[PDB]
Paper text:
The coronavirus [name], S, forms homotrimers embedded in the membrane envelope of the virion. The mature S protein comprises two subunits, S1 and S2, generated by post-translational cleavage of a precursor polypeptide. The receptor-binding subunit S1 is variable in sequence and associates closely with the more conserved membrane fusion subunit S2. Intersubunit interactions influence the conformational states and dynamics of both subunits, regulating exposure of the RBDs in S1, their engagement with cellular receptors, and subsequent entry-related rearrangements in S1 and S2 that drive membrane fusion between viral and cellular membranes.
We performed cryo-electron microscopy (cryo-EM) studies to define the interactions made by residue 835 in the WT SHC014-CoV spike. Extracted particles were subjected to two-dimensional (2D) classification, which resulted in class averages populated with fully closed trimers, wherein all three RBDs are in the ‘down’ position. A 3.1-Å–resolution 3D reconstruction of the WT SHC014-CoV spike trimer was obtained and found to resemble that of the closed [name]-CoV-2 spike, which was expected given the ≈80% sequence identity between the proteins. The flexibility of the NTD led to poorly resolved regions of the map for this domain, preventing the modeling of some loops based on our reconstruction. C–terminal FPPR residues were resolved (residues 832–840), affording an examination of residue A835 and its local environment. A835 is part of an α-helix proximal to the FP, and it lies at the interface between protomers (buried surface area upon oligomerization: 22.7%). The A835 sidechain is pointed inward toward V946 in the S2 heptad repeat 1 (HR1) of the same protomer and toward residues D555, V556 and S557 in the S1 subdomain I (SD1) of the neighboring protomer. Residues 555–557 in SD1 connect A835 to the RBD in the neighboring protomer. We propose that the introduction of a negatively charged residue at position 835 decreases the stability of the spike trimer by disrupting a network of hydrophobic interactions within (A835–V963) and between protomers (A835–V556) and triggering unfavorable electrostatic interactions between protomers by virtue of its close proximity to an electronegative surface region in the neighboring protomer. In the WT spike, F294 is located near the C–terminus of the NTD, and is coordinated by contacts with K266 and K288 in the adjacent NTD-RBD linker to form a ‘double-cation-pi’ sandwich.
Numbering used by the authors:
A (entry chain B): 686 to 783
B (entry chain A): 539 to 616, 622 to 664, 673 to 794, 796 to 811, 832
C (entry chain B): 833 to 1027
D (entry chain A): 881 to 1124
The structure:
Amino acid sequence: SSIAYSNNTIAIPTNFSISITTEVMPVSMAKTSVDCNMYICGDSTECANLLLQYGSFCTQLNRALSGIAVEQDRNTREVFAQVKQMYKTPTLKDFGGF
Amino acid sequence: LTPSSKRFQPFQQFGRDVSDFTDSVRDPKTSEILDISPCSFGGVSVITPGTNTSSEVAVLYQDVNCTDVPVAIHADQLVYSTGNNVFQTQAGCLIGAEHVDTSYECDIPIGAGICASYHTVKSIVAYTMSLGADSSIAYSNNTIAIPTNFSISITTEVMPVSMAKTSVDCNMYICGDSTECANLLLQYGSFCTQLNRALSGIAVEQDRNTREVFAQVKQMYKTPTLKDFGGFNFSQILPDPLKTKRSFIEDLLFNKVTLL
Amino acid sequence: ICAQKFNGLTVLPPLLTDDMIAAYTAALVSGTATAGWTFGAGAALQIPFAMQMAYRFNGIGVTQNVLYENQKQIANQFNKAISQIQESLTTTSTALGKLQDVVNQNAQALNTLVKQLSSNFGAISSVLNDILSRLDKVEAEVQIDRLITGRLQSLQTYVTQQLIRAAEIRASANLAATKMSECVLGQSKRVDFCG
Amino acid sequence: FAMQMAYRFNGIGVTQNVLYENQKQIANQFNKAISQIQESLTTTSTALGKLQDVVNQNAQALNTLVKQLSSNFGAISSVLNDILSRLDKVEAEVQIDRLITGRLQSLQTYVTQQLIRAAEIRASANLAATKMSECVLGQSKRVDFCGKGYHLMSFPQAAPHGVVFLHVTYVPSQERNFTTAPAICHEGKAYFPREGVFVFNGTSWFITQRNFFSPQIITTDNTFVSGSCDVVIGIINNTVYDPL
């Protein structure tokens, strides 16, 4: 672009336009949940007994997943639930030509 | 085991899926294809108002269409399975909770816009969530509402600023005091050295967080002796000289939070 | 999805259904159209839309006579821009590329987790049934341990990736909440924040 | 302080005469709100639910880490003493390796979770620093950033592992309906208001602020002319008093 600098000249607009732009923002992600035995073992009693010996690994995994899910619910609620009143939709939807 | 329509090759004896799960098998004596599914079936969730309050609970089956998928070969029914007080929640069947048309705030979320709570009637009640207080707004082309009075509202905002600084030891944790275990651990490299580096970074970051949040004034302005400024009583939020260095609200806040 | 269901992998439905979010957005738009910026700062005070737009023009250093003299042009530009965005959205486009990206990311993560079962992790086989039907208990312990360690590592990797993705999505959601507070419920003086 | 609050009122579109005339009411409301928050804090409340939440999170993480030692991780036992006293060196190497790998994995999981939590806490701390800069050391024009309503000032307070901000806000109330006009036609030219809006109490047309009903006579200093009366819709005929 060519920009000319002047010590005694200014450019001022004489008209204007209305521009509507879109901005897309992710707000939440899918809430997932997993099972200790059905994934690690399935339906095997012996595998379940063996897995018990590892302690509280999958318990903490479940805790993390639950935290993620409740966080997603909170994300959506805080982004959207910002009006305390559910204003009624007007039947007349033209407001001074808009 | 259940009958299946799966197409098996002439010689095939069993078949599995992408996750190497044997979802089909051939009967060696009758040569009929049988599908086999797990027993857990996934997704049972329990809704409890707290053992301290009551021992009554409700059961949500995530994707059942209110049927007996949890094969009924157990005494009792698992609270019940396909009883009378059944509600068909979007993506779920809920049993043990009473459905009420009136909608309230959410207490125990279930999903699909359905929440449950321990209301009195005392039992577990499920309902649809309440979005907000319905309001009537009148639009006029030649009228406006202007306020004629005002009020002063003081609101609180709590913000975590730092977390506890933790440090760990390589041998004291992994091994303890065993020389042989320490020698064996040396062969694993520099794992715990990098763990210590990460923990030190976290601790220094916490110190920096607190300092940057609070250390924004280069001058420690003196606390005024007169704590009334044109009728504004600041004595509740400023330290009391007689006491110790904290203000009353600060003392309340420290007391509120409980800090093998 | 059937394999995910048979391996304990499930998706919980969101708390707010699409209808409730649509109701929230309709309420917000109605409040903006009727009460203007005021409904976000306390009580909702009605104002004719022309006067609200005159105040919004004043907010950007333009006297209100401009709007009262060019109302027809401004309304026509508003409507034409709305129709343009409508058509832009309806013509196959990547406008919603972030949302589809997060959906695809979640689907791919679940698919990778479920497909990780096929790996035998250096054991005799990746299936417990054949290990238990071929090798006796004492010898089978080693194979079972190998498979359990591998599958636990897969679960931990999935959980860590989900945690980091959730942190990123929380950052985006906080930005969206701030944008709703500052652009929708009021007029924003920050440059390039609200468009 | 009176003049400081007068400037803060001016900052939200309210003339300073409002404060100088209602100083007693504003001070009383300030004190009543402070007492209300005091009593709110003293009554068992979840006000500090985030701070206690982070404390509980750290405690639970440490407890899980320490309890992870009881797991034998598929080895002969979870204790090194009995393994070393029962099995000779070469054979015991397998058990030692099993336990060491398990405990290293537990430590790595704990450290990764701590790193993610530290990132979240850093985000919160940066937000708190921005709030201190913009709400406490100044007046914020951002909506809902420094409390619901129109921001006047803020006061910080310490708390275990966090900061509590007391945001003072001006919320209008006691609404009144009025009939208004975009402009006023006078001698064939349209007068627009320099600030505020025209209103009609039922007797005559006045000019007032948007944020407070302070009716004032329509003059030439608070109104400016532009164009004619045939180009704006809603213009209503009336006279504009001239101080001369």
